[PDB]
Design a protein around this ligand. Structure first.
Ligand code: HEC
Length: 102
């Protein structure tokens, strides 16, 4: 995993999402600070779709990788309008950039 490539890949997420210490969500999507290991659809102050609002899943690396590859294959009714990252390197790299160690 190359977190440097990951930061570049992440530019596709950064208009919808925020990712900072402020707790404030992005223009269209939740703050991704603290994502790794977080319960799905739980960060306060963001109105999730019913699928994510009602989920008991956790954003493990394995669950995040599946979701980034094809969001509606994991949560069909999601409001995330994103086709998915089909390149395995780009998924692993952006996950690496999104890790707590980053
Ligand atoms: C706008 C067009 C988006 C782009 C581009 C990306 N995401 Fe997104 N994401 C978006 C919305 C509107 C939502 C909420 C969905 C719902 O059904 O309520 C999300 C949600 C996520 C989550 C779940 C967060 C949680 O706290 O459970 C994750 C992990 C996520 N998005 C990641 C992500 C990444 C890594 C992206 C770039 C590759 C990305 N999103 C793009 C809107 C949009």
């Amino acid at each position: 995993c190359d977190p440097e490539n990951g930061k570049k890949v992440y530019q596709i997420c950064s208009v919808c999402h925020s990712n900072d210490t402020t707790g404030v969500h992005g223009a269209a999507a939740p703050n991704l600070h603290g994502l790794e290991g977080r319960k799905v659809g739980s960060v306060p102050g963001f109105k999730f779709s019913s699928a994510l609002r009602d989920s008991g899943d956790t954003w493990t690396p394995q669950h995040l990788d599946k979701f980034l590859e094809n969001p509606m294959a994991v949560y069909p009714l999601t409001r995330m309008a994103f086709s998915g990252l089909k390149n395995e390197k780009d998924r692993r790299d952006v996950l690496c950039f999104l890790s707590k160690s980053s």
